[PDB]
Design a protein around this ligand. Structure first.
Ligand SMILES: [Zn+2]
Ligand SMILES: [Zn+2]
Lengths: 50, 203, 252, 180, 242, 226, 62, 48, 90, 50, 190, 141, 55
RNA sequence: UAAAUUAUGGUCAAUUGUUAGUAUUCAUAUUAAUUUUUUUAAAUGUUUUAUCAUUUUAUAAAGGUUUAUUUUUGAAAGAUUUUUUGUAUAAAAUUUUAGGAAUAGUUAAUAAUAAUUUAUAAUUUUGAUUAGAUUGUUUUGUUAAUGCUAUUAGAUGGGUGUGGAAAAAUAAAAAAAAUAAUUAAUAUAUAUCAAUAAUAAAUUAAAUUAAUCUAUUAGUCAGAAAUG
């Protein structure tokens, strides 16, 4: 739930979102941050301030 | 919803951008920065700016919430006979949920799920649920049934105090029982010779 | 597959899908099919303990108005065969009925004769099974058949069982089950107290066996065209007894 | 159980069938073909809803690239990715607790997930199916034996309750002097 | 019929299919014509191995296009022959001069597309001449004797059973893989040492040998070999939670 | 339901079997329980090719018009009998011959001695219909030692697949009720020399090596070339 | 060749050798004029064999 | 067809007891035009 | 399906079925190596169908416990407010 | 099962949690927090806050 | 997709990033009315038909709609809508049976306004107490006949005038002076 | 492959009758006189009759009436065995009998032989006691 | 021919009869429209009930 | 009947027509269409079973409906050593047509009643019954927007009353009781009513597997552009 991406991408949250990448050698591993962020609707950020 | 021509639920959550072949705009080698803004990021109407449902376009009070606080006391009333139905059902299902396969904890689960259902577990739903975990020797569970009865701030009737007290017997902890004594089964007085034995139901 | 709750479907003034009412009929071998394996447990009973109404001294004497008021369900064993009053007797030699009494006779004194008696009222039928000879049971001194003077007397004791009922009646009002009290054989223990106590030496351990088991004859797999995997087929290991996951001994 | 059966579309038994974790997906042009993974019953009406239980996810049969991560010098990461979104916890409740039938293409996926063991029909054609014999099977169990006192535990805490209220830290629930 | 219209799939190399009216028109009207500064052969100094890998006869005969008629950036779809391996394709001088795009088989002579030269994965001749004898004769073995053991090069070889031509990866043959790729089967040696149909036999030999030795076939024998041979010394075990 | 295989499993649909329940599966379909069926089609396939050149006589071939040479009617008797013994003998053709209707004699269909199967039917009664070869055949069943405790009706008597090795000891007349066989654990104690049990409730015989080398050959562990 | 609608017998010619039966794909078969229900069934049985099932199953046209 | 412009599913559970749409899934004439009226709402709205 | 081996027992009959289900004892033995490598398989597949009742319940336990610990603070606080507004109304 | 468990315990890389198999993170039916949904007025989850 | 522009469309199969998949039905079609009768020959009597109908329900327009927020939901909490209904019991002449006439809520979104509406119900009353007019509470149950799914769950005010009117003997309520509206000039003289 | 649905219930478990679809439709008034004629055709009766509401297998009673009124052939009984053969084909060949022949009633028929004709007759009664009624001949047959 | 088909006057389901019993085992035919009759149709005036001794 | 801010807090509302004295949602525009273009479909033989039988496999033909369509474990999921239970038909809100009026196996109570039981019965102008169009309540189009204007396909009686549920006389593209098979999504020219292609419509080329297609009309007084 994109409203709560900063929650569901925080290790301290036990209800964290779960992503797994099974490499092509069968080894399971857990996501990269970039892939985690891929699964939400596109996040724009540009601080015009300075 | 699903597998009709117009699938909705697969777009209902967020899938990254599939660039596997020319789905029309040479999606697979053409990388499509501006094509996404103008074209595939949905819009507020034809031509309006790209609406971004992003995870940074939601208000920062959304992350700072504790759990289940959005949930308000829901006082749900159900017909009388419908009360009876669902009562006998969560009773039957604390006694036995699945036929032969249950873990002991299915009463406990069914007591809670009675709670989460915004239901009022009667004392019979407590007696039952305490017997069925005593039988199974899940006494820490027959205790947490006490604690559920207590977090409910409920008044264990004589039957229920006897029940939990058996549990203290079997687990062998005097403390566990001393508080039930201190709390509830103190104003219990033996039947003095003059007074009526089974004082009638009153309310 | 379990049992549903209520008939919500049909007008109950016309009984529709109801499994029909079993009626044991005295004419046909079904009567004895049901009342036959029951007698053997009342025999093991009256050979273990004393139960009152079994070992009478004679018939019951009651007017034909009250005959059906006490008898129906009366079952007792007399010293010898003798038709009670107000009855006629019909011997039976049908082998398809007699066949059942095999388990009766191979556990107690073998059965000599079998009759069906009908009252002159036509409405009280007494299956009367007369037994013969030395019993196979170690009848206990404090039995009822022990007071029947049969095990006291030597061989050639012809005692006889009677079971009265009304006819055309289901196997429910055949009050022959209420004596299914199971009492064991203590005569078996009676060895270790009398003069065999110094004669018998018991061994508590096992002896040193240096020899493994001699194997069965080598297995020749079947050669007929088999039904198939008796697991997948829902057929109990011998179509007789066992567990469908304990599929021992069906061809393999 | 029907007078004139529906011919291409009979299942085994009954009108509302057992729940099954199917992985459907509409047949249009391959480029536009991705799979609606979802719990549902066997015997449906013509569409995928009337015995739809619980949308379970979506699969992309088309292996996509690392255009969400940078260009690593790491092979297994540069390989195409095949992506799917499950409903892990309602799958556990349906499959595990309500016992819905796990069809073979969906299983082919979740096997790759790591939830379920790799299926029956991921047949390594290149190795034969096994040869069972009681002599060797019992001779092994003879050789290596595990105990009742190590097996009953795992049986319990693997099919029955497993939150061991640590006997020591059940002390935190046995009150102190004001009520002890 | 109908499915004639379906576009041919495009992968992660294929750029613009040019499969509709406006998809070709604005590129159709580019009436190219070869001038002396267009002429590829004027540019041998820079593009010597682009000159030396042209199937010239295959081109002219089939196309009506001459080695002289070739631009250095000619968009015409001509045929070439790899001067490293020796396979034939139909590739335009444009996507071969702009991008260094070539033979679909010499695409993988280098072990991993990503890190192509860094591989110190050893060569073929200086490492394993027992492949140098089974590889198909090319007269380019003088150069292929440097292909890495880890190369995905779909190299063609002589089999030993059917004598014929079987094409397999140099790595899928040799067995060893550069540290950190997708590794290949434990038995890929024994299941590509032969022909795609005659690689069956050298396998079930040791498989039935154990059905005989043990009266029972269970793939777990390699496992149990590894436990009866390789004791773990100190493999850290996690503090239990129960 | 009551006893499905390995419990209730669902990695397939076939993991239960071609029926999940030794019980019926409806209370309105009593017959659909699981009995040990023995082929009805192929073991009611009476070879008509034994009965071709015989010039049969029908029960309306009673006319003098149709009466045949008694030598050819003898051809007809030998033909009809060889015609019924084509697959085998029904029990009602087995134990019409043996004295006392074979009561007490332990029958067995052919499989009931082959494999781990070890069973007989210490038959207890036989009753014949007007047409013989049909009727009600009751018998104290005996599996791997243990008998029923009452005479049950015997299934697939009226199919031709039977045998019996009449031993004179079991000749039980029409006057004495069949004394039921003893079971080897209960009614008679066990001896390790007179009877030894073929297979127990756990037992499964080692692999027939002809079957192991057929399966190897087919599944391509044993090379199989023409 | 079991099904009266999967007559795999009719096209023993389209394949030259055993390997060109075991290595033609389900689209390589539409290359070879083999109609729909035929080539799917060919592919079924071919992959059954590939594993170790020989097509030893009964013929029900009749 | 977006959900943010919709009141979520779990509110029919919070109204009619958790997992009580399933007993209507398993119904007979479920799907032809009508279904069991699914009471997803804001909770701050119930007439009840 | 239930396979129709060409070495089944062909019911030599024109009315029902030219091939019946009646194995040659090779089949009832081959069918063995068939239906035990599936029960080697669906031993883990039904070992899980429980483990995901040890996992989905030993999680609904914790989470309904926590949902009630929070909906109880909420239930109790809204109940208190109803009592208070009852006072101010009086 | 036994020989596979022997080799699995022999595998060092194992004995790590695969959070897809180990727990059902939120088994109840409803989220732990209001997630961008509408409000009494329809103020869709973006036009509001909790 | 919908948010895309006609010529910027490519592929009507999928939706690439997100949005609403839906079939752009063709509302713009000039539905018509084929006159199959004559302005003086119609096989109806009351409501003649002479132009296209707008069809639907929860679709007609003015868009009336269900609204539970009425008197009933202000007074009673309910398990399911319509359970509890308060009205002037009107009509009880069917022995042991009451007709309770109580209102619901019909909200008009376009206008931003309401009108609650009338309905003569059936309501069982074992023992025949209520008289026409007692403001009563009525609750739902299991059905009681073809048409009564309700029962008189209380009285909120008994028409004491009426009860005494019966006790004295007269009709607890005089009957309406005139009938239903007719079309014939009924000439009552003397 | 169950005909449970296509035909009415009581016709569950009807085999070896041909084309039962006529009794399904036997109530419809045209088929009614159609079978009024088929029953009169089969005869044995006098007044109109059809097989009752839900019967396809003709009544056991009517089948016995026709099976006993069908005149037994051999109107020329002369020798002992022709009389005995009429009696035997009334005993063990009247409809639905429960008695099965006796070797002692084969003996009498077998001992009424004068001619090769009676040789054939008692020989066929041997045929039947051998193969139709499944009996055991005496020791001395 | 002059009313509903399965009237609710006779629509009754008694639950002091065990489960399944009316399904497939046994018929319980009775007259339930007198045990389901109301105090307004009989006359039961619920008098104060005295207990044992005072009775 | 008080100002206040610890400074944009809680996430985009915004209307683009050349008219013709004036009053008035009303020709010409743009958006969504339809008219319009073959890149989504498609085949026959359901399948087991012990056998002339039986186990398994239940809402697309119409049928004309606006006080309308509603229901369960007993089938199955489904796990044990046996007899094992109380959860279902009900509803509730919304119902069209210019000129508007009477309708009827009837209403309630008794009832496991009354083809002739009792009665001051019931539907209706809060718009009934007849007849007419019409598939019924998260799918669109336009609009900044209350609106206006859309969404399919599915339930058309009972008659031996089988089944868990009549929904049952042919019209998947669900693997359908042994792992068949997925190296597969491809489907030949066959169809339904869905499904918007003119996909860089004109100079620099397609790190392809070289596959389909040769590509066009408008106006020319107002108002871009005219004469013979
Ligand atoms: Zn090359
Ligand atoms: Zn080779």
């Amino acid at each position: 739930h994109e409203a709560l991406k900063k929650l569901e991408l925080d290790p301290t949250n036990e209800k964290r979102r779960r992503f797994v990448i099974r490499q092509p050698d069968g080894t399971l591993r857990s996501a990269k941050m970039s892939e985690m962020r891929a699964w939400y609707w596109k996040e724009e950020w540009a601080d015009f301030r300075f | 919803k699903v597998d009709h021509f117009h699938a909705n639920n697969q777009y209902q959550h967020a899938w990254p951008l599939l660039s596997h072949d020319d789905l029309g705009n040479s999606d697979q080698s053409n990388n499509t920065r501006n094509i996404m803004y103008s074209m595939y990021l949905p819009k507020r109407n034809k031509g309006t700016a790209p609406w971004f449902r992003g995870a940074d376009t939601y208000s920062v009070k959304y992350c700072e919430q504790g759990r289940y606080e959005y949930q308000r006391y829901l006082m749900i009333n159900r017909f009388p006979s419908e009360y009876r139905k669902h009562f006998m059902n969560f009773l039957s299902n604390i006694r036995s949920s699945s036929g032969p396969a249950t873990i002991p904890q299915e009463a406990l689960h069914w007591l809670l799920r009675m709670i989460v259902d915004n239901f009022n577990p009667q004392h019979v739903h407590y007696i039952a649920a305490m017997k069925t975990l005593q039988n199974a020797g899940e006494l820490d569970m027959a205790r947490d049934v006490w604690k559920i009865m207590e977090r409910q701030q409920t008044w264990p009737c004589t039957s229920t105090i006897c029940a939990y007290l058996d549990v203290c017997v079997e687990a062998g902890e005097k403390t566990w029982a001393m508080e039930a004594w201190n709390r509830y089964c103190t104003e219990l007085k033996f039947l003095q010779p003059g007074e009526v034995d089974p004082k009638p139901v009153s309310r | 597959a379990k049992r549903f709750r209520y008939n919500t479907k049909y007008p109950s003034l016309v009984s529709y899908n109801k499994l029909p009412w079993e009626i044991l009929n005295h004419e046909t071998p079904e009567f004895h099919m049901h009342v036959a394996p029951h007698y053997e447990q009342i025999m093991t009973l009256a050979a273990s303990t004393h139960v009152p109404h079994i070992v009478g001294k004679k018939h019951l004497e009651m007017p034909p108005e009250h005959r059906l008021r006490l008898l129906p369900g009366m079952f007792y064993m007399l010293d010898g065969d003798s038709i009670p009053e107000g009855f006629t007797a019909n011997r039976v030699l049908d082998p398809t009925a007699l066949q059942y009494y095999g388990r009766l006779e191979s556990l107690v004194a073998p059965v000599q004769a079998v009759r069906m008696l009908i009252s002159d009222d036509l409405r009280i039928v007494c299956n009367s099974v007369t037994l013969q000879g030395p019993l196979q049971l170690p009848v206990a001194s404090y039995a009822s058949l022990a007071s029947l003077e049969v095990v006291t007397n030597k061989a050639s004791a012809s005692f006889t069982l009677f079971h009265f009922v009304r006819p055309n009646r289901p196997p429910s009002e055949l009050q022959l089950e209420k004596y299914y009290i199971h009492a064991p054989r203590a005569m078996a223990l009676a060895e270790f107290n009398s003069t065999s106590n110094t004669s018998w030496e018991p061994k508590l351990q096992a002896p040193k066996r240096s020899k493994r088991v001699t194997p069965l004859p080598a297995y020749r797999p079947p050669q007929s065209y088999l039904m198939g995997l008796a697991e997948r087929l829902a057929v109990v290991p011998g179509s007789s007894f066992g567990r469908r996951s304990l599929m021992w001994g069906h061809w393999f | 159980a029907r007078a004139i059966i529906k011919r291409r579309t009979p299942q085994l038994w009954g009108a509302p069938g057992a729940p099954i974790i199917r992985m459907r997906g509409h047949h249009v042009v391959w480029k536009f073909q991705s799979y609606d993974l979802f719990v549902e019953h066997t015997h449906k009406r013509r569409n995928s809803d009337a015995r739809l239980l619980h949308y379970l996810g979506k699969h992309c049969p088309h292996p996509q690239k690392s255009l969400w991560s940078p260009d690593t010098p790491v092979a297994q990461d540069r390989h195409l990715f095949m992506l799917t979104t499950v409903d892990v916890d309602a799958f556990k409740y349906w499959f595990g607790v309500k016992r819905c039938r796990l069809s073979m293409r969906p299983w082919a996926l979740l096997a790759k997930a790591g939830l379920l063991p790799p299926s029956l029909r991921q047949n390594s054609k290149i190795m034969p199916k096994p040869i069972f014999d009681k002599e060797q099977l019992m001779r092994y169990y003879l050789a290596n034996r595990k105990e009742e006192a190590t097996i009953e535990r795992e049986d319990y805490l693997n099919y029955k309750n497993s939150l061991v209220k640590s006997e020591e830290e059940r002390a935190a629930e046995r009150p102190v002097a004001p009520y002890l | 019929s109908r499915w004639s219209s379906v576009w041919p799939n495009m992968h992660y190399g294929a750029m613009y299919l040019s499969y509709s009216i406006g998809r070709k028109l604005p590129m159709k009207g580019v009436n190219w014509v070869t001038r002396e500064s267009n002429r590829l052969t004027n540019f041998s100094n820079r593009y010597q191995a682009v000159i030396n890998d042209i199937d010239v006869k295959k081109t002219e005969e089939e196309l009506g296009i001459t080695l002289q008629d070739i631009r250095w950036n000619d968009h015409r779809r001509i045929y070439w022959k790899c001067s490293f391996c020796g396979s034939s394709y139909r590739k335009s001088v444009s996507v071969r001069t702009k991008f260094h795009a070539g033979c679909n088989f010499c695409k993988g002579r280098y072990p991993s597309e990503v890190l192509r030269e860094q591989h110190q994965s050893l060569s073929l001749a200086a490492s394993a001449p027992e492949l140098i004898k089974q590889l198909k004769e090319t007269d380019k073995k003088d150069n292929l004797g440097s292909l890495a053991l880890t190369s995905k090069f779909r190299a063609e070889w002589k089999c030993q059973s059917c004598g014929g031509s079987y094409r397999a990866s140099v790595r899928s043959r040799t067995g060893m893989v550069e540290n950190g790729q997708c590794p290949l089967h434990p038995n890929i040696v024994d299941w590509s040492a032969y022909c795609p149909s005659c690689s069956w036999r050298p396998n079930m030999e040791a498989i039935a040998e154990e059905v005989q030795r043990t009266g029972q076939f269970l793939g777990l024998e390699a496992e149990s070999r590894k436990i009866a041979s390789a004791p773990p010394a100190r493999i850290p075990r996690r503090k239990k939670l129960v | 339901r009551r006893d499905a295989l390995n419990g209730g499993s669902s990695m397939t649909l076939g993991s239960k079997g071609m029926k999940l329940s030794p019980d019926p599966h409806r209370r309105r379909m009593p017959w659909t329980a699981a009995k040990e069926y023995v082929p009805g089609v192929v073991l009611n396939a009476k070879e008509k090719m034994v009965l071709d050149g015989v010039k049969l006589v029908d029960v309306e071939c009673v006319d003098r018009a149709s009466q045949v040479d008694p030598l050819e009617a003898l051809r007809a008797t030998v033909a009809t009998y060889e015609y019924n013994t084509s697959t085998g003998k029904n029990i009602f053709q087995l134990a019409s011959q043996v004295e006392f209707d074979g009561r007490g004699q332990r029958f067995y269909r052919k499989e009931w001695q082959e494999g781990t199967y070890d069973k007989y039917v210490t038959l207890s009664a036989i009753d014949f219909n007007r047409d013989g070869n049909k009727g009600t055949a009751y018998g104290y069943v005996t599996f791997h030692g243990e008998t029923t405790t009452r005479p049950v009706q015997i299934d697939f008597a009226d199919v031709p697949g039977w045998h019996m090795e009449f031993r004179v000891e079991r000749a039980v007349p029409f006057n004495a009720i069949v004394p039921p066989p003893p079971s080897i654990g209960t009614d008679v104690p066990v001896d390790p020399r007179s009877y030894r049990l073929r297979a127990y409730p756990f037992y499964d015989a080692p692999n027939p090596p002809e079957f192991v080398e057929r399966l190897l050959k087919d599944r391509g562990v044993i090379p199989d070339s023409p | 060749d079991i099904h009266r609608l999967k007559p795999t017998s009719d096209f023993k010619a389209a394949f030259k050798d055993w390997n060109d039966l075991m290595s033609c794909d389900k689209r390589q078969l539409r290359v070879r004029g083999i109609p729909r229900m035929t080539r799917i069934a060919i592919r079924n049985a071919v992959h059954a064999f590939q594993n170790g099932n020989p097509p030893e199953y009964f013929d029900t046209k009749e | 067809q977006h959900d943010e412009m919709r009141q979520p599913f779990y509110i029919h559970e919070k109204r009619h007891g958790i997992f009580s749409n399933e007993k209507n899934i398993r119904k007979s004439r479920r799907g032809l035009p009508f279904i069991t009226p699914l009471y997803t709402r804001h909770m701050n709205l119930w007439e009840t | 399906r239930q396979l129709r081996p060409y070495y089944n027992l062909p019911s030599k009959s024109d009315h029902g079925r030219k091939m019946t289900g009646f194995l040659t004892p090779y089949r009832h033995w081959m069918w063995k190596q068939n239906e035990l490598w599936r029960n080697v398989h669906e031993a883990q597949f039904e070992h899980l169908r429980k483990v995901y009742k040890r996992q989905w319940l030993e999680s609904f336990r914790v989470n309904a416990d926590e949902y009630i610990y929070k909906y109880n603070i909420t239930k109790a606080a809204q109940l208190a407010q109803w009592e208070y507004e009852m006072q101010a109304q009086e | 099962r036994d020989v596979e468990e022997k080799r699995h315990s022999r595998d060092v890389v194992n004995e790590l949690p695969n959070p897809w198999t180990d727990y059902v993170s939120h088994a109840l039916p409803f989220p732990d927090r209001d997630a961008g949904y509408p409000d009494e007025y329809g103020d869709i989850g973006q036009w509001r806050a909790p | 997709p919908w948010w895309n522009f006609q010529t910027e469309h490519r592929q009507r199969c999928v939706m690439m990033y997100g949005g609403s998949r839906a079939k752009n039905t063709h509302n713009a079609n000039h539905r018509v009315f084929i006159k199959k009768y004559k302005r003086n020959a119609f096989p109806n009597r009351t409501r003649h038909h002479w132009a296209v109908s707008m069809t639907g329900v929860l679709g007609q327009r003015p868009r009336r709609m269900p609204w539970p927020y009425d008197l009933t939901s202000l007074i009673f909490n309910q398990p399911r809508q319509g359970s509890d209904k308060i009205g002037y019991v009107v009509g009880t002449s069917m022995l042991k049976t009451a007709v309770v006439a109580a209102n619901h809520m019909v909200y008009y979104p376009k206008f931003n306004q309401r009108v609650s509406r009338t309905s003569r119900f059936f309501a069982h009353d074992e023992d025949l107490a209520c008289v026409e007019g007692d403001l009563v509470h009525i609750k739902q149950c299991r059905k009681i006949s073809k048409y009564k799914h309700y029962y008189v769950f209380s009285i909120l005010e008994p028409n004491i005038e009426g009860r005494e009117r019966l006790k004295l003997g007269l009709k607890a309520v005089p009957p309406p002076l005139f009938g239903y509206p007719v079309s014939r000039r009924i000439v009552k003289l003397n | 492959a169950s005909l449970r649905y296509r035909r009415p219930y009581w016709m569950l478990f009807l085999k070896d009758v041909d084309n039962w679809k006529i009794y399904t439709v036997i109530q419809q008034p045209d088929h009614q006189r159609t079978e009024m004629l088929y029953q009169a055709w089969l005869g044995g009766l006098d007044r109109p009759y059809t097989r009752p509401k839900c019967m396809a297998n003709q009544p056991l009673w009517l089948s016995k009436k026709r099976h006993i009124l069908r005149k037994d052939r051999l109107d020329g009984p002369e020798t002992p065995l022709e009389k005995y053969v009429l009696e035997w084909h009334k005993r063990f060949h009247s409809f639905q009998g429960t008695e099965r022949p006796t070797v002692d009633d084969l003996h009498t028929a077998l001992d009424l032989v004068e001619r090769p004709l009676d040789l054939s007759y008692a020989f066929q009664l041997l045929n039947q006691c051998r193969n139709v009624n499944n009996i055991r001949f005496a020791k001395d047959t | 021919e002059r009313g509903l088909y399965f009237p609710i006057n006779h629509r009754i389901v008694d639950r002091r009869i065990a489960s399944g019993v009316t399904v497939e085992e046994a018929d319980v035919q009775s007259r339930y429209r007198r045990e389901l009759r109301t105090s307004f149709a009989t006359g039961e005036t619920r008098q104060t009930i005295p207990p044992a001794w005072s009775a």
